[PDB]
Amino acid sequence: ARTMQTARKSTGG
Amino acid sequence: YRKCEKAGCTATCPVCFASASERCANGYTSRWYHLSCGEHFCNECFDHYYRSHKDGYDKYTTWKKIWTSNGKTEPSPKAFMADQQLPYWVQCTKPECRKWRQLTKEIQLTPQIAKTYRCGMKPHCSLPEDLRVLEVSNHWWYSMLILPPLLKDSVAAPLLSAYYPDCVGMSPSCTSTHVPGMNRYFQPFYQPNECGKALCVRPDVMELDELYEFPEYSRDPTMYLALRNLILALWYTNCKEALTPQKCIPHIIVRGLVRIRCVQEVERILYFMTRKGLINTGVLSVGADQYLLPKDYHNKSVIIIGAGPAGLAAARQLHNFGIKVTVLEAKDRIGGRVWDDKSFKGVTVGRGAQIVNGCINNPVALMCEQLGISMHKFGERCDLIQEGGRITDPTIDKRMDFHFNALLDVVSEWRKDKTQLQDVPLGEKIEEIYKAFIKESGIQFSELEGQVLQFHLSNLEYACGSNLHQVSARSWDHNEFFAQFAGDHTLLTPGYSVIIEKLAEGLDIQLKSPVQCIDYSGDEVQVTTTDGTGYSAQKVLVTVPLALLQKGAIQFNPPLSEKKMKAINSLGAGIIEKIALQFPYRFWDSKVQGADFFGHVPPSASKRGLFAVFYDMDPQKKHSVLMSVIAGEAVASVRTLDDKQVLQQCMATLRELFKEQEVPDPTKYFVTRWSTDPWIQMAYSFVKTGGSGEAYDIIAEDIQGTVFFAGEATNRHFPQTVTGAYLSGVREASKIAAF
Numbered sequence: 001a002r003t004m005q006t007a008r009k010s011t012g013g
Numbered sequence: 014y015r016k017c018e019k020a021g022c023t024a025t026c027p028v029c030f031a032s033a034s035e036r037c038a039n040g041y042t043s044r045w046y047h048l049s050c051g052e053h054f055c056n057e058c059f060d061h062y063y064r065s066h067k068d069g070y071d072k073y074t075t076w077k078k079i080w081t082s083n084g085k086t087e088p089s090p091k092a093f094m095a096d097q098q099l100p101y102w103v104q105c106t107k108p109e110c111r112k113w114r115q116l117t118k119e120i121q122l123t124p125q126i127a128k129t130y131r132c133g134m135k136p137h138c139s140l141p142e143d144l145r146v147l148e149v150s151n152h153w154w155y156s157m158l159i160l161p162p163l164l165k166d167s168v169a170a171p172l173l174s175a176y177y178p179d180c181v182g183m184s185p186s187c188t189s190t191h192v193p194g195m196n197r198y199f200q201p202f203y204q205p206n207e208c209g210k211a212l213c214v215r216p217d218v219m220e221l222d223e224l225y226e227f228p229e230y231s232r233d234p235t236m237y238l239a240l241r242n243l244i245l246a247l248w249y250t251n252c253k254e255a256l257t258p259q260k261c262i263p264h265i266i267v268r269g270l271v272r273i274r275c276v277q278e279v280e281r282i283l284y285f286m287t288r289k290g291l292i293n294t295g296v297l298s299v300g301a302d303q304y305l306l307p308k309d310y311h312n313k314s315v316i317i318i319g320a321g322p323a324g325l326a327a328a329r330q331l332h333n334f335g336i337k338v339t340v341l342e343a344k345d346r347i348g349g350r351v352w353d354d355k356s357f358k359g360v361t362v363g364r365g366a367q368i369v370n371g372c373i374n375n376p377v378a379l380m381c382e383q384l385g386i387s388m389h390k391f392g393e394r395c396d397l398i399q400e401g402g403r404i405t406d407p408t409i410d411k412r413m414d415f416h417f418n419a420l421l422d423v424v425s426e427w428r429k430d431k432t433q434l435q436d437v438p439l440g441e442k443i444e445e446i447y448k449a450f451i452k453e454s455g456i457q458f459s460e461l462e463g464q465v466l467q468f469h470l471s472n473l474e475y476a477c478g479s480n481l482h483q484v485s486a487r488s489w490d491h492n493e494f495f496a497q498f499a500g501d502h503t504l505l506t507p508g509y510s511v512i513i514e515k516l517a518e519g520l521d522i523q524l525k526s527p528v529q530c531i532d533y534s535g536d537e538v539q540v541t542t543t544d545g546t547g548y549s550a551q552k553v554l555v556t557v558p559l560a561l562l563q564k565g566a567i568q569f570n571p572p573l574s575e576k577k578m579k580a581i582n583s584l585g586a587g588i589i590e591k592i593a594l595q596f597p598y599r600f601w602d603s604k605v606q607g608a609d610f611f612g613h614v615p616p617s618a619s620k621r622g623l624f625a626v627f628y629d630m631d632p633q634k635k636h637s638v639l640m641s642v643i644a645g646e647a648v649a650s651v652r653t654l655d656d657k658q659v660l661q662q663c664m665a666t667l668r669e670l671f672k673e674q675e676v677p678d679p680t681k682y683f684v685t686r687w688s689t690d691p692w693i694q695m696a697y698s699f700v701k702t703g704g705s706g707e708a709y710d711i712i713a714e715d716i717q718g719t720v721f722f723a724g725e726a727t728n729r730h731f732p733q734t735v736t737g738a739y740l741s742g743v744r745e746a747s748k749i750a751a752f
């Protein structure tokens with residue numbers, strides 16, 4: 001899950 | 014008429030409550046007007062306000078102008094009477110009698126009045142309470158009420174300004190329609206027309222849980238929504254002490270007999286919200302005398318396996334309820350994947366969890382408020398330094414971040430109307446779509462543009478806790494179909510260990526006690542340790558890591574179902590590792606200039622997860638502790654090396670990143686080895702190619718109301734995180750407590 005990203009997070013889709 | 018023309022009234026001959034007119038009929042009147050079974054008003058008093066030539070017409074028109082502006086509900090003399098004329102009802106304060114009395118019509122009820130009221134208090138207890146009082150307890154009683162109660166001066170009102178008061182349980186005539194005394198991260202209510210935000214509730218709509226528990230309000234919810242909304246507000250304005258019925262009652266200000274219904278019902282609603290963990294939770298701890306649920310819930314025993322956030326959350330709840338809980342933990346410490354190193358000068362650094370992703374409504378945020386502790390909000394800036402020293406051109410990062418997101422955008426297009434069987438690894442899918450743009454466009458990427466792309470992929474690998482060739486293209490971001498936690502990403506400066514210790518405080522916890530077997534083929538659950546010690550209880554809660562369910566460390570008897578096992582094995586036990594370095598002085602300040610972190614552009618593709626990002630562990634910019642992560646294939650590349658060899662590897666990278674100066678040797682370090690910690694063997698879960706996010710739900714289903722499952726890998730909305738685990742603890746505690 002991308003909800004773990006803090007730095008430079010993805011906005012992918 | 015000397016009797017009520019409304020279908021089924023228990024009043025053959027009615028009394029007027031109002032006394033507005035001189036012509037106020039005990040006696041005959043053309044029409045009686047029915048508000049409730051015990052509450053009626055004559056046509057003289059009705060004319061008093063309704064009719065031009067009469068005296069009370071002044072009041073009523075004044076009131077009807079206000080009511081039309083604020084509220085959606087229709088003005089009417091019935092409404093006016095219910096809002097403005099009906100007497101107030103008050104229970105007695107003194108525990109000996111506690112009888113309900115009517116107040117004289119000329120007195121307005123207030124919190125302090127209702128806090129301190131004894132029988133016959135003009136601005137005694139032997140007199141029998143009114144006939145109508147006991148009739149209020151009947152089922153149909155609420156059915157014979159003309160209008161839903163509307164509360165005055167509700168604690169919830171500042172939170173609810175964007176709604177019409179009547180659409181949400183409140184009186185549109187009340188003068189008292191970011192709030193003072195409330196944490197900026199507590200946003201319990203959805204705003205009208207607001208998109209998905211985690212843990213928010215609609216103030217004007219009963220939730221499904223509430224409908225099933227209180228199906229009597231399916232017909233008419235407004236009394237429910239008024240009391241729920243009040244309670245939530247009382248809780249969030251004072252979240253360090255237990256919310257009890259005694260503390261709520263003084264804030265229910267509504268005139269009439271319906272107030273007594275409100276007071277009686279407020280107790281059931283409160284217990285429901287407590288059990289569910291919406292109220293009276295966090296690291297709130299209650300004294301030995303007090304318990305959060307009534308004695309009915311207490312004849313249950315539970316053993317909880319694992320004392321991470323999931324097992325501790327569940328324990329705390331059940332303990333606070335008055336249920337008997339005992340916790341069995343394999344290691345010689347609590348915390349599971351929460352484990353904080355306290356030995357660095359000044360700062361505190363976690364070996365596992367330390368960030369909170371989305372504070373708004375996050376239970377972690379509430380716990381920080383309770384313990385008065387700080388969260389450092391992360392800044393946006395993160396510059397990508399290359400092996401050499403060159404901070405990457407701003408217009409290079411921006412556009413490679415763009416390109417990266419477009420790939421993923423193409424992936425989500427690809428995955429529509431596909432099935433688990435048609436699934437494909439996210440890593441394969443990405444590079445395929447990558448090669449396609451190269452080909453169809455003709456333009457090619459430089460070595461740097463490629464390197465910067467790789468950094469972005471490594472961030473995904475960090476997030477998933479795996480190489481992308483293991484992660485499901487269909488379902489990698491499954492959880493995002495649900496409302497996520499809005500707001501700040503913060504560093505939890507004193508560490509999650511403060512929270513973990515507080516939760517644990519004064520619970521029956523057995524350390525160095527790995528469970529080997531669970532027997533539930535009997536009446537009692539039978540739990541056995543590796544050494545042989547036996548524990549038994551009515552119910553058991555497993556909260557062990559995904560990786561240990563996959564290794565089958567625990568023998569279940571009966572075995573788990575083939576469905577459960579397919580669920581368990583369809584998820585990936587993801588892994589990252591960390592390194593922390595101490596230094597004598599902050600050698601990065603000049604180059605980094607106070608950002609929370611900085612990037613590291615991977616020299617080659619195969620060195621991708623090797624210290625992609627370095628975190629600055631002092632929000633104060635005083636101490637010199639950096640932290641970094643190892644992820645993806647880099648985790649494999651580091652399995653064999655020992656701490657020293659890893660430390661050197663990290664040091665090589667820093668000197669290359671900070672070429673334009675002398676890089677001091679570290680004085681203190683650690684390197685994490687979660688994957689080889691026999692009772693954990695992972696960092697967090699993720700969906701493997703072929704899998705579905707339904708796996709979480711499946712893993713979460715109890716067996717025969719006796720074996721329950723909580724944890725990181727049981728939370729479909731919020732996988733991976735301390736918040737997710739905590740919430741799974743609270744979710745299971747709620748089921749365990751039920752009936």
Ligand SMILES: Cc1cc2nc3c(=O)[nH]c(=O)nc-3n(C[C@H](O)[C@H](O)[C@H](O)COP(=O)(O)OP(=O)(O)OC[C@H]3O[C@@H](n4cnc5c(N)ncnc54)[C@H](O)[C@@H]3O)c2cc1C
Nearest residue numbers: 319321323343349350366367368528724725733734735738
């Ligand atoms: C390096 C790292 C960084 C992370 N970063 C973050 C972060 O920044 N933010 C965030 O929210 N989350 C983060 N996480 C994830 C987070 O730590 C976990 O998701 C969370 O701790 C899960 O809690 P749990 O209760 O489900 O599992 P655990 O914390 O793993 O609890 C499992 C417990 O069960 C015990 N156990 C196992 N087998 C047995 C047995 N047979 N008998 C008794 N006990 C047993 C284990 O000893 C362990 O104590 C990180 C994790 C790691 C490893």
Ligand SMILES: [Zn+2]
Nearest residue numbers: 017019022047
């Ligand atoms: Zn009637």
Ligand SMILES: [Zn+2]
Nearest residue numbers: 029037055058
């Ligand atoms: Zn009258």
Ligand SMILES: [Zn+2]
Nearest residue numbers: 105110132138
């Ligand atoms: Zn009394």
